[PDB]
Design an enzyme around this catalytic site. Sequence first.
Site, PDB file in Angstrom:
ATOM      1  N   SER A   1      47.580 -28.690  64.612  1.00  0.00           N
ATOM      2  CA  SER A   1      47.339 -28.059  63.127  1.00  0.00           C
ATOM      3  C   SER A   1      48.303 -28.720  62.349  1.00  0.00           C
ATOM      4  O   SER A   1      49.415 -29.416  62.711  1.00  0.00           O
ATOM      5  CB  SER A   1      47.210 -26.482  63.125  1.00  0.00           C
ATOM      6  N   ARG A   2      47.939 -28.884  61.031  1.00  0.00           N
ATOM      7  CA  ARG A   2      49.001 -29.479  59.970  1.00  0.00           C
ATOM      8  C   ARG A   2      49.652 -28.664  59.218  1.00  0.00           C
ATOM      9  O   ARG A   2      50.878 -28.873  58.811  1.00  0.00           O
ATOM     10  CB  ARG A   2      48.016 -30.261  59.271  1.00  0.00           C
ATOM     11  N   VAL A   3      49.186 -27.403  58.851  1.00  0.00           N
ATOM     12  CA  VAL A   3      49.723 -26.666  57.741  1.00  0.00           C
ATOM     13  C   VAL A   3      51.018 -25.956  58.099  1.00  0.00           C
ATOM     14  O   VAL A   3      52.239 -26.048  57.509  1.00  0.00           O
ATOM     15  CB  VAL A   3      48.495 -25.459  57.090  1.00  0.00           C
TER      16      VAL A   3
END
Lengths: 232, 177, 495
Positions: free
Chosen positions: C356-358
């Site tokens: 994931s990125r956030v």
Amino acid sequence: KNLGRIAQIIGPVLDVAFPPGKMPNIYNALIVKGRDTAGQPMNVTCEVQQLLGNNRVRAVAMSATDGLTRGMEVIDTGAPLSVPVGGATLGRIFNVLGEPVDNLGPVDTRTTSPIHRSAPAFTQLDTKLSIFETGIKVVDLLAPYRRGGKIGLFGGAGVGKTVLIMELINNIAKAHGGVSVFGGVGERTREGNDLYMEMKESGVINEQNIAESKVALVYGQMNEPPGARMRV
Amino acid sequence: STASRYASALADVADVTGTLEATNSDVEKLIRIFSEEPVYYFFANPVISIDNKRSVLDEIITTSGLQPHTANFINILIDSERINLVKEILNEFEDVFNKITGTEVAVVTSVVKLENDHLAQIAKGVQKITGAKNVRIKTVIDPSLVAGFTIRYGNEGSKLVDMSVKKQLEEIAAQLE
Amino acid sequence: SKIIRERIEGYNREVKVVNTGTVLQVGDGIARIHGLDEVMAGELVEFEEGTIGIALNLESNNVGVVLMGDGLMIQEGSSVKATGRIAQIPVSEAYLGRVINALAKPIDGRGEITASESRLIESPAPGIMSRRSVYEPLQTGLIAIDAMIPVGRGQRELIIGDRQTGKTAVATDTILNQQGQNVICVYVAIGQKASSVAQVVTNFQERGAMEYTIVVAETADSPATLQYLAPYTGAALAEYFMYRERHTLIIYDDLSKQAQAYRQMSLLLRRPPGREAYPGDVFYLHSRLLERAAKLSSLLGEGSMTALPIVETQAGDVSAYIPTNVISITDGQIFLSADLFNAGIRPAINVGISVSRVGSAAQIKAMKKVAGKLKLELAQFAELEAFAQFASDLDKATQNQLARGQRLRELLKQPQSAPLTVEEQVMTIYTGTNGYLDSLELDQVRKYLVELRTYVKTNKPEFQEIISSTKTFTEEAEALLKEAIQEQMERFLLQ
């Protein structure tokens, strides 16, 4: 001074019956002056992809094309995407159209230069294989990154190209006098918003001292019909 | 081309007929007829009832009075929906006429509208150079023709032969050489 | 001659219908169409037999219409009078419980969902300027999700996996936990089984999540125009919620079905086929689709549009053109590993490949304090997953970290609809990090963690109150957690 009827449109592949003489060259641009969804005049940046013949040409626009009707006129710009070159881009997050997508007002700069241009010649360059020396210590140690070079990345988010490219931006801005063109192609708009937030937040976009802003932000939207993104 | 084949067959019909001139006249008349973009669309829309189009077709076959071989040629043609592919085969009929003839149309292009005697000399010289049976002269008084002329001849206007600023191109070449 | 030109003038005046275009090449829901040239690109148009034609192919010659459905009554030469409107589905909040077909028309049968604002389905995307920071969180109910992968309000994340996996139901579990959330829940069921559609709807209304949830669905027998745009329709439903500054979430059932659909479309358009027969326009199409999902700016009200992408790896291709395209497109990705489901762990999230990125902007600091240790111990056990069969000769800290990661691994699993709150998970993580579950045995710690959750709901509800109010893992609250932890530890220690 060319006006092409919108001949066909195979989706984002538009087709344009130009005039028999006034049919442009390869990658010559055209403002398709169509209506908006409002019916207000909206001008698209159709790009001469294929001289389809019979004085017609398979074009590609960068933006969307809904509301465009067939037969609509495209005044051919007849040249590449002349884009606002120089410092008005150095700081304004500029669209592929050359509008500042930043909503930082219009980029008032006369220097609009041809986009799909050549490279230099076999004689013009500077073949001293110099080091684009970073200031980041490991790349200083490990990476013999060529000046004028091609530093490919096998690493992105998590691995931290945000902060590292930011410090690299500050470093090429400071240790060198060079400036930076940062382009988010097919951009995560989360990452785009945070990226402009970062450059403002770093001051890479010197937020008060705009255009002392050391970066030039060109995101390519993934939301763009990605024929846009090929020429970004 | 198959359009060129349609033209070649129309010329063959007119040729074994002898109506190469007559259906050529029909070709020019019907060319100006089908030059009407509304008539070309109305005959050439798929929405056209080919019953009603055949009605209007015999109506137009009257309305210019076509010769019968070319009339049945048009009937097979619009019958075979290459009416959509019509006009250039019509145009090719012209070359097919010359293919029937050997009268070679060659376009001169000079500073002046040149002498018809000079036209006669050039057409005779091209009847020798082409080896031609005849030569439909296709003149032009070209503006960028500085003083001399430009005779596009051959199968196309391929066989260009020009002395107007062409020698100036040669002089700029030998300068650059 | 104008007698003949009068005759063909009348015939072509008959051919001079403006809005109409006769059905030229009627094939398989697609038509070339003479006439109706002056249409704008892409509108619906009313054919004969009423038929809605999606004006997909602006042919120079013809008018290429994706028919809305099957047109046996749409005869040869069927005149499509131009409608000019395109996709302006009337979106209101009055569908939040109605199950709409693609016209925003209730395929429920919940009555005509009254709706004044009508948005064209493909509205434009929000700019990066139109989006603020991703501050506010989503929360799946899946403790294992939000632990190893924090979900913000209005972000983009895939759930890749395999057939109907309960990844379907994993999205349903997210939708269930949306009931406690303030976000608008919107179930976009492309191509589910009808029985599955109904069992999902029964799951929603049985949760009462259908209060918070509207439903739209494509059939398996859908005209793929409706499939091919109903995604954008749900996106605009999210727009009518999200331009209204509201948190709102969407659950896009697998756009791979839409990829087969647009494949059928362009092949039906006789158009150029791309990488494994999906159109190249599917890249930009799903790009436009998933592009609009965000938390807005405060200029647009920070309205969250929280996407949930269903992606099913066709026999485990993590790199289908669909899959790798989405893998480019996403920010959070959720690989699923039904190996874990086959070994037992629903949720079978492939916790390693799910990247994931956030991150911490989407996590509570409450969560984050535990969750960093969860990550460290998780990767520690992940490398040490090799030692298992030879873990008789395991070192004290080796077998001990193995036990710690073992209890943490126990602290993952949850059935179909076993969502938890943030706070119960906080107690769970703090105990599993706090080794009180390094004590308890395998199924024992499952029931005991359930009991610790229950006896913390009772026996330390003010710790949950502080974890609500502060939304911060207070050392007071961690102390009350340790208190109830030892208390229920005694309670299940007597067992």
